[PDB]
């Protein structure tokens, strides 16, 4: 009686994920990952969400993020996401990819999405092999994904490969001048996304900032019709992972309702876990609200990381001493701005 209304809702929730995937129904793994693609996979990352493999599509490296959905098994300590809970990342990963090709508000600072599919089956044995390798060489905090039955649903998002995350780059960043670049790129991306989409990332921990070498001297973005450039210092930053994000599409708010979560707001041993708490306090546990200040908080967390946890290959020179002094002033003042858009446009760090 509610059985009818519930399964009709499933349903429904299923019909929106297809065809946000432009599917009518689950496809096999080999639809997304033919043998040759699958043969080139090497596990590159992981989280509680699932697994990230790098491979090649059309002569180009891609990152494939695999998330088990809708099944009853705990995966990596957590429940699998439903059709209804997985939708936001899907929709948001889509909207943020399109920013690179938009006119008035334009940025390449988010990860490009090639495609998103809802896939059905057990874990490809070739992936399990790739899972095994990483486990032998980096160590996994994850369960081995070998228990999925062949009715098991996954979302596979195929992203451009953004390079390596800021955490892993902990000790490879050459100077304070680079830290300023990365920070400049992050603020501008967030600012472009704020202006186009009323976007807040809400989970911009340093594993979610990817860095790739570029031969470009200057990177370009467009904010409300005005193009400007950022000196690359040789890296392009990509912001990934929209699991907690919020934006509006036309005028429909899309977001991760965490209003009933508690584990998210009780972490410790990192400043990262205070940001979740500050966001909740600042938005009163109403997560559909627009609070761009949250982007500033994550930028403040990211700036802390740069000052406290980066070990650079190059102090150094009076020049970098000064930059150091500026990131430090940046760190002390940025919280007195209302948004990444306020920061980008007004902070002396970016002039």
């Amino acid at each position: 009686l509610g059985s009818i209304e519930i399964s009709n809702k499933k349903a429904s929730d299923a019909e929106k994920v297809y065809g946000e995937c432009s599917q009518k129904g689950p496809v096999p793994f080999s639809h997304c990952l033919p043998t040759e693609k699958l043969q080139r996979c090497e596990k590159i990352g992981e989280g509680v969400f699932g697994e990230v493999f790098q491979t090649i599509a059309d002569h180009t490296p891609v990152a494939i993020k695999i998330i088990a959905i809708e099944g009853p098994d705990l995966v990596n300590g957590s429940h699998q996401k439903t059709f209804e809970e997985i939708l936001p990342e899907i929709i948001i990963s889509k909207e943020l990819s399109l920013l690179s090709g938009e006119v008035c508000n334009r940025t390449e600072g988010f990860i490009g999405l090639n495609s998103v599919h809802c896939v059905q089956g057990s874990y490809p044995p070739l992936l399990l092999k790739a899972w095994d390798h990483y486990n032998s060489t980096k160590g996994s905090a994850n369960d081995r994904p070998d228990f999925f039955k062949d009715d098991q649903l996954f979302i596979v998002l195929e992203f451009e490969f953004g390079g390596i995350d800021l955490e892993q780059m902990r000790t490879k960043l050459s100077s304070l001048a680079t830290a300023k670049s990365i920070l400049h790129q992050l603020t501008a991306s967030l600012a472009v996304a704020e202006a186009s989409l009323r976007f807040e990332h809400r989970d911009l921990h340093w594993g979610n900032v990817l860095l790739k070498k570029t031969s470009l001297k200057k990177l370009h973005y467009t904010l409300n019709g005005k193009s400007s450039t950022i000196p690359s210092c040789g890296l392009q930053v990509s912001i990934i992972d929209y699991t907690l994000s919020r934006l509006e599409r036309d005028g429909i708010v899309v977001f991760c309702d965490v209003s009933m979560d508690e584990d998210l707001f009780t972490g410790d041993g990192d400043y990262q876990f205070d940001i979740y708490r500050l966001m909740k306090k600042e938005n009163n546990n109403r997560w559909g609200e627009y609070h761009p200040y949250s982007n500033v908080l994550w930028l403040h967390y990211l700036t802390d990381k740069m000052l406290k946890q980066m070990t650079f290959k190059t102090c150094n020179t009076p020049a970098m001493k000064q930059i150091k002094r500026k990131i430090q002033e940046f760190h002390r003042t940025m919280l007195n701005f209302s948004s990444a858009t306020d920061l980008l446009c007004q902070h002396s760090l970016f002039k």
Side-chain angles (χ1 to χ4, degrees), residues 39-141:
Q39 286 213 258
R40 302 318 116 82
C41 301
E42 316 155 334
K43 179 183 169 151
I44 54 166
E46 64 172 32
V48 187
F49 67 79
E51 310 284 335
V52 188
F53 299 89
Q54 175 181 338
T55 189
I56 144 190
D58 290 319
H59 300 201
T60 305
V62 294
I64 299 190
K65 190 192 180 171
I66 310 174
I67 314 160
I69 62 162
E70 283 281 332
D73 324 295
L74 295 184
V75 182
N76 313 320
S78 197
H79 234 138
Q80 303 166 42
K81 261 139 186 50
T82 56
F83 291 117
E84 167 197 287
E85 280 137 5
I86 193 63
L87 199 50
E89 184 171 7
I90 300 178
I91 293 177
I92 296 183
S93 313
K94 282 160 54 147
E95 288 300 305
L96 293 167
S97 179
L98 303 172
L99 286 175
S100 66
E102 287 295 288
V103 184
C104 294
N105 286 302
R106 191 187 162 285
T107 173
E108 301 181 349
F110 298 94
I111 202 58
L113 182 84
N114 294 341
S115 51
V116 45
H117 294 116
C118 178
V119 122
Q120 188 175 34
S122 48
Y123 231 69
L126 278 156
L127 292 187
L128 279 165
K129 171 149 81 181
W131 198 93
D132 282 346
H133 180 88
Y134 179 100
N135 191 27
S136 307
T137 62
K138 299 203 173 304
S140 183

Side-chain angles (χ1 to χ4, degrees), residues 96-101 106-112 160 162 182 184-190 192-193 199 201 204 208-211 219-222 230 236-242:
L96 293 167
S97 179
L98 303 172
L99 286 175
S100 66
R106 191 187 162 285
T107 173
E108 301 181 349
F110 298 94
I111 202 58
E160 306 199 306
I182 302 169
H184 199 169
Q185 304 182 56
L186 295 160
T187 317
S189 303
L190 287 178
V192 180
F199 167 81
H201 196 275
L204 196 41
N208 281 345
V209 172
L210 308 189
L211 315 159
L219 297 158
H220 309 273
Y221 69 93
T222 315
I230 305 182
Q236 192 177 300
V237 171
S238 290
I239 294 158
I240 68 164
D241 183 7
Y242 316 125

Side-chain angles (χ1 to χ4, degrees), residues 163-216 218-222:
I164 304 271
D165 76 55
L166 183 58
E167 182 172 52
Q168 300 162 90
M169 296 284 281
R170 205 144 148 70
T171 77
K172 330 274 186 214
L173 272 257
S174 39
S175 88
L176 291 316
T178 185
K180 183 177 147 206
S181 201
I182 302 169
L183 296 176
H184 199 169
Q185 304 182 56
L186 295 160
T187 317
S189 303
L190 287 178
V192 180
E194 283 179 348
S196 190
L197 294 168
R198 290 159 88 60
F199 167 81
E200 319 166 37
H201 196 275
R202 309 192 172 172
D203 192 27
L204 196 41
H205 51 84
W206 59 342
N208 281 345
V209 172
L210 308 189
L211 315 159
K212 231 204 276 185
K213 300 177 188 89
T214 179
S215 43
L216 276 205
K218 311 177 295 179
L219 297 158
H220 309 273
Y221 69 93
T222 315

